[PDB]
């Protein structure tokens, strides 16, 4: 009686939101950006190849200086690279080799990683002893750690396969806020540039926008047909793009609270692993299961170019803060640095 | 062309590469085993004989270092991380023979033995384990014999025309799992009957792994 009545009210509320989004769907982003000229063909060459990982690379993250990056592989090795020289700055042996994510702190003093061990481990890069040591192990998730991102040297947000995200106080080792509401494994998260919000994509094919301080879900974005594996905020923080196993990338708007554009091709039938934007946001770069990275026109949904330099899955990618280059990590155990030439 | 600190930084990177190579060579020599099986299948008892996320067991037997990975504690989506174990030497699958007449606790309408069949079929025919051999432990053999006298296999297998002897009942169950192998040429299934009092379970894994290693070498050279 009461349960049946309540679940009927949820359906009425869902229709109310769907009608509200349809009311403000006056135009399409495709129609708006029809007049602007295309970006042309985007040609990028492999400037650097980072060799030394001996297993599948699962994650990479640039440091904020646009020169150092950290990559994680399931050979149990965290490597910090000097991308300008390809020198290895550090090699951090992981206690658990089943790493799935890694993050570089914006200060450059810490890196974080974690996987099937259900732990987010914090590593101190600047010690008087001259070696990288574990500074914190964040326990509390009951599923694998899928993504982690620093807010500062003391706070980090983690998404897990136990359907929840958490905000952690690194010094006390406790999760201050728990973000619940996903019905599937949360596979990725992205921080807004002001670090007041973050979006997460789960296996319920939905993306939720969370308030960091308040700790609740502000908006829910649907439209994917399969698990979301990747997510990335637009550079101004007013939009984000997702990548799913349905071979599509979608651009959702925060303020319009709906999808704006879909990035898919008929030839593309493989899942998407990673998404990122160029510095101006005009380019959407996506890594795929078909060993390739497709550069999309974000505004016009045109495939601008292809980065074809890996013999296995493109598992991760990232664009530097200065926008100079893009790094691609792959299951073939290599990282590549790409940019164009005049 | 390089400064004094640039040369020192390059030299430090060279030392890291040497250490990465040594660790990789050591890892390649170890034997990786993915330990699978449903709950209450005797899988925990197997670990003790072999002496909140993933549990790793390390043991040495006849100069061979084994790394056994237990993933039963993980309750998340299997398809999001099962590819992480692509490349293990072999998969150890545990099936409790005494659960043929039991009913799954959660479902209350699914046979416990039939629950392992769909788990075995998914793992055996998984795309990430096309060329991976499977070691099948049929546990609770002493308890299975006791239950056979009281409860026949007709409850578990309605279309069973065999007798109720201990040898015939166990052999039929073994053939049921091996028939689920949709790729009988790329991979092989090694079946062993285990018990809580058995002490030859480690030897069987060593023999099965040694056979897998030999066939891997023959296939790598292109002989197969």
């Amino acid at each position, epitope marked *: 009686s009461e349960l049946d009545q309540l679940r009927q009210e949820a359906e009425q509320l869902k229709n109310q939101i769907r009608d509200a989004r349809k009311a403000c769907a006056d135009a399409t982003l495709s129609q708006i950006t029809n007049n602007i000229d295309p970006v042309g063909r985007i040609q990028m060459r492999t400037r650097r190849t980072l060799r030394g990982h001996l297993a599948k690379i699962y994650a990479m993250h640039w440091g904020t200086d646009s*020169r*150092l990056l950290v990559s994680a592989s399931q050979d149990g090795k965290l490597i910090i690279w*000097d991308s300008y*020289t390809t*020198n290895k*700055v*550090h090699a951090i042996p992981l206690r658990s080799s089943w790493v799935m994510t890694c993050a570089y702190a914006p200060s*450059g003093n810490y890196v974080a990683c974690g996987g099937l061990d259900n732990i987010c481990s914090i590593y101190n890069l*600047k010690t*008087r*002893e*001259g*070696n990288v040591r574990v500074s914190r192990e964040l326990a509390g998730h009951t599923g694998y750690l899928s993504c982690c991102r620093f807010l500062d040297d003391n706070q980090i947000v983690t998404s897990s396969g136990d359907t929840t995200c958490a905000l952690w106080d690194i010094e006390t080792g406790q999760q201050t806020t728990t973000f619940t509401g996903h019905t599937g494994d949360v596979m990725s998260l992205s921080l807004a540039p002001d670090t007041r919000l973050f979006v997460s994509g789960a296996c319920d094919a939905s993306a939720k926008l969370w308030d960091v301080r308040e700790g609740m879900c502000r908006q829910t974005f649907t439209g994917h047909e399969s698990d979301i594996n990747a997510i990335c905020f637009f550079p101004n923080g007013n939009a984000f793009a997702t990548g799913s196993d349905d071979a599509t990338c979608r651009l959702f708007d925060l303020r319009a609270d709906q999808e704006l554009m879909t990035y898919s091709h008929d030839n593309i039938i493989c899942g998407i692993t990673s998404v990122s934007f160029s510095k101006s946001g005009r380019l959407l770069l996506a890594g795929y299961d078909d060993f390739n990275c497709n550069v999309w026109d974000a505004l016009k949904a045109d495939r601008a170019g292809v980065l074809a330099g890996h013999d296995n899955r493109v598992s991760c990618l990232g664009v530097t803060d200065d926008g100079m280059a893009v790094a691609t990590g792959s299951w073939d155990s290599f990282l590549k640095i790409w940019n164009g030439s005049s | 062309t390089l*400064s*004094a*600190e*640039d*040369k*020192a*930084a390059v*030299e*430090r990177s060279k*030392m890291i590469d040497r250490n990465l190579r040594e660790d990789g060579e050591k890892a390649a020599r170890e034997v990786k085993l993915l330990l699978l099986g449903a709950g209450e299948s005797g899988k925990n008892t197997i670990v003790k004989q072999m002496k909140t996320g993933i549990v790793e067991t390390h043991f040495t037997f006849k100069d061979l270092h084994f790394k056994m990975f237990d993933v039963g504690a993980q309750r998340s989506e299997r398809k999001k991380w099962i590819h992480c174990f692509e490349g293990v030497t072999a998969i150890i699958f545990c099936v409790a023979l005494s659960d043929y007449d039991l009913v799954l606790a959660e479902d209350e309408e699914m046979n416990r033995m039939h629950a392992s069949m769909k788990l075995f079929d998914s793992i055996c025919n998984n795309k990430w384990f096309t060329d991976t051999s499977i070691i099948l432990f049929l546990n609770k053999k002493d308890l299975f014999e006791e239950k056979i006298k009281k409860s026949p296999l007709t409850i578990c297998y309605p279309e069973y025309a065999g007798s109720n002897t201990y040898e015939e009942a166990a052999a039929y169950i073994q053939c049921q799992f091996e028939d689920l192998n949709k790729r009988k040429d790329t991979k092989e299934i090694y079946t062993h009957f285990t018990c809580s009092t058995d002490t030859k379970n480690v030897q069987f894994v060593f023999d099965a792994v040694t056979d897998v290693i030999i066939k891997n070498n023959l296939k790598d050279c292109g002989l197969f």
Partner: single-chain antibody, 231 residues
Framework: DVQLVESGGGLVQPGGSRKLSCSAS????????MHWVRQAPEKGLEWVAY????????YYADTVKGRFTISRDDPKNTLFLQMTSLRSEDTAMYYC??????????????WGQGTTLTVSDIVMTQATSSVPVTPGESVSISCRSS???????????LYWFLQRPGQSPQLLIY???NLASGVPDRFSGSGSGTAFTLTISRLEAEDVGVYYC?????????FGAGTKLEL
């Protein structure tokens, strides 16, 4: 805590041999390159030798090459300096210095207390030998180099050290602008090409001492004469 203890120094006869030891505790010794730096009595710092992490690269100063041998024992965390044919020119306090080299590292960050031995090229110029100072007032120290210390990679390999009376040198500024860990922000390093300035805003009693500018552009590492601050 990070420690570097030297031993084996003492009065030796001319033409003799002596073995200096540097025991390291509290840090990953095998990860750091090691230098021997000596300081003649009432004189400035002079670099002696360098052995890299992993013992693959070894450098010597010309005045000691062929007579000194530098070695390390990584399992024992000991740095060695085997000296032969010791001359009266070798009478100095010998310091054990750790230095790690990667992008953004701070070489020469920790020095040992030193052991005293008594026996019976880019030019770095610090023309101002002494500077009278008063607490709370801003002080500038100048350094010059015969060659440009700015490399084509953008680094300017100039270092600033402070040796307080009775103490071992401590790193203040590395690569001409970066502030060493544990150093107050009042110290600031400014330079261009061959001319460099160390500015000390709001001078305090602790800042009193001798200041050395060192180049790390190439071997042999050379020190300036040193500028002394006095009240």
């Amino acid at each position: 805590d990070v420690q570097l203890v030297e031993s084996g120094g003492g009065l030796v006869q001319p033409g003799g041999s002596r073995k200096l030891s540097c025991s390291a505790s509290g840090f990953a010794f095998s990860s750091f390159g090691m230098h021997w730096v000596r300081q003649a009595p009432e004189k400035g710092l002079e670099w002696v030798a360098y052995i890299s992490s992993g013992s693959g690269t070894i450098y010597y100063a010309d005045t000691v090459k062929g007579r000194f041998t530098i070695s390390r024992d990584d399992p024992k965390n000991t740095l060695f300096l085997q000296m032969t044919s010791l001359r009266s020119e070798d009478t100095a306090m010998y310091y054990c210095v750790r230095s790690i080299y990667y992008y953004g590292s701070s070489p020469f960050d920790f020095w040992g207390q030193g052991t005293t031995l008594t026996v019976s090229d880019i030019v770095m110029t610090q023309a101002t030998s002494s500077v009278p100072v008063t607490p709370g007032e801003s002080v500038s120290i100048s350094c010059r180099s015969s060659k440009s210390l700015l490399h084509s990679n953008g680094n300017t390999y100039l270092y600033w050290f402070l040796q307080r009376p009775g103490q071992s040198p401590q790193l203040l500024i590395y690569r001409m602008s970066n502030l060493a860990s544990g150093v107050p922000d009042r110290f600031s390093g400014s330079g261009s090409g061959t001319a460099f300035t160390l500015t000390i805003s709001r001078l305090e009693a602790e800042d009193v001492g001798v200041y050395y500018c060192m180049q790390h552009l190439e071997y042999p590492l050379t020190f300036g004469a040193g500028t002394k601050l006095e009240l």
